[PDB]
């Protein structure tokens, strides 16, 4: 499997036409602060293709 191709799975809002976003800021899904790391109901925004 080639897992070196990433796509954005989580984002706070939608993109505008031809807008670029290559940030790695973690996404908070729950109401509990993730403290900018990872863990309970918060994830790294990028996902790999198998």
């Amino acid at each position, epitope marked *: 499997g080639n897992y070196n191709y990433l796509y954005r799975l*989580f984002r706070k809002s939608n993109l505008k036409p031809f807008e670029r976003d290559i940030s790695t800021e*973690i996404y908070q*899904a729950g109401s509990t602060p993730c403290n900018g790391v*990872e863990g*309970f*109901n918060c994830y790294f925004p990028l996902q790999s293709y198998g």
Partner: antibody, heavy 120, light 108 residues
Framework: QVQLVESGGVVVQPGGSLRLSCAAS????????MHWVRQAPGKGLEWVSL????????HYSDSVKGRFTISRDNSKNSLYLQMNSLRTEDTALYYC???????????????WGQGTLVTV | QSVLTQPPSASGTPGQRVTISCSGS????????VNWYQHLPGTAPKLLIY???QRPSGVPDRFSGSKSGTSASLAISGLQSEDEADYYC??????????FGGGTKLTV
């Protein structure tokens, strides 16, 4: 093309020590948290346990806490569940499932295995 | 014999819209997010809704939901004969661990 394949769904004497094994492919294994969920016949879904990618934390439902052990091997892309002190109440279709994203964790997401039947 | 509470069944005429409710404590819904699953008999369960109202790839806009107060609900519009499945409510507990509801049987 994510797949999860369970094995070990056999009929076991309650006094035994059956282990289940889930093979995983089609996604990054070593960065993802995984869960076990079981469905007893005639009932709904019952959550069993989770293990995070780095082994940083493990959680068990009280009904299996202290009697089940969850472990993973990131070099084999496989998840294991050891179930001891078995009860007839443990008869269920056991499913292997993964979380939504990398690093963190919450509940089983979109990719579920076919599961295998454990009879006690 | 579950923490999250759901009705035993739901029904309606194809083309109509129905809702499936889910209730629990502040430790289940009030302080956490609710996920929904659609389990079609004969195969594995699949995620339908996550984080209250988000959809995974492959799930159409006929499936939506919300969370308010200490309760949550799933709305299924455009009922199809292929949606005759058991819908499950789930959340992470503050005292316990992972929690699933009884499951609501939706029928034509």
């Amino acid at each position: 093309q994510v797949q999860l394949v369970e094995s070990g769904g056999v009929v076991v004497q309650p006094g035994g020590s059956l282990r289940l094994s889930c093979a995983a492919s089609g996604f990054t294994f070593h960065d993802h948290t995984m869960h076990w969920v079981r469905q007893a016949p005639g009932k709904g879904l019952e959550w069993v346990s989770l293990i995070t990618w780095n082994g940083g934390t493990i959680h068990y439902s009280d009904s299996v806490k202290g009697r089940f052990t969850i472990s993973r091997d990131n070099s084999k892309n496989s998840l294991y569940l050891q179930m001891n002190s078995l009860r007839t109440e443990d008869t269920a279709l056991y499913y292997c499932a993964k979380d939504l994203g990398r690093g963190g964790w919450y509940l089983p997401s979109d990719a579920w295995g076919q599961g295998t039947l454990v009879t006690v | 014999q579950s923490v999250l509470t759901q009705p035993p069944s739901a029904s309606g005429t194809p083309g109509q819209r129905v809702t499936i409710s889910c209730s629990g404590s502040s430790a289940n819904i009030g302080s956490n997010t609710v996920n929904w699953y659609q389990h079609l008999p004969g195969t594995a369960p699949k995620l339908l809704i996550y984080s209250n109202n988000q959809r995974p790839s492959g799930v159409p806009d006929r499936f939506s939901g919300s969370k308010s107060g200490t309760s949550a609900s799933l709305a299924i519009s455009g009922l199809q004969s292929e949606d005759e499945a058991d819908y499950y409510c789930a959340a992470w507990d503050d005292s316990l661990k992972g929690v699933f509801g009884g499951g609501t049987k939706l029928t034509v």
